[PDB]
């Protein structure tokens, strides 16, 4: 009698545990890779920077000084640590004269 109903429940409980095992391992692999990616992006964020690496030049209708023409300056990645993306679709340059 009991050598059958017990066996069925065992089969079901094994499958139930195997399903959790399947999900847990998959999701561990997923999340740990998200962590890897994040750690890389954190290091990129801490390393990447621009330094002002020349004087700032300003041009006007001198000597009359009624009108403003251009500004020029020079930049380079800070301390030579890593490269900087300067594409104008992604980068912004803001200008304010408060």
């Amino acid at each position: 009698l009991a050598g059958l109903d017990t066996a069925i429940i065992l089969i079901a409980f094994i499958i139930t545990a195997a399903v959790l095992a399947y999900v847990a391992v998959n999701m561990g692999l997923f999340v740990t890779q998200k962590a890897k990616t994040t750690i890389n992006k954190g290091e990129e964020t801490a390393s990447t920077a621009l330094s002002l690496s020349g004087n700032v030049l300003y041009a006007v209708n001198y000597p009359t000084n009624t009108k403003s023409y251009w500004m020029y300056f020079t930049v380079s990645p800070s301390s030579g640590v890593s490269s900087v993306d300067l594409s104008p679709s992604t980068t912004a340059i803001s200008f304010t004269a408060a």
Binding site: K41, A49, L50, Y69, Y72, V75, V84, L86, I93, A97
Partner: peptide, 27 residues
Amino acid sequence: MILFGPGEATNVFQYETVTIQITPNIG
């Protein structure tokens, strides 16, 4: 290099603070 158009060109910067910021997509 920043070139000024007719709006911002209208009179010279004097006794004023000017600020420029460059913001790349990372860093």
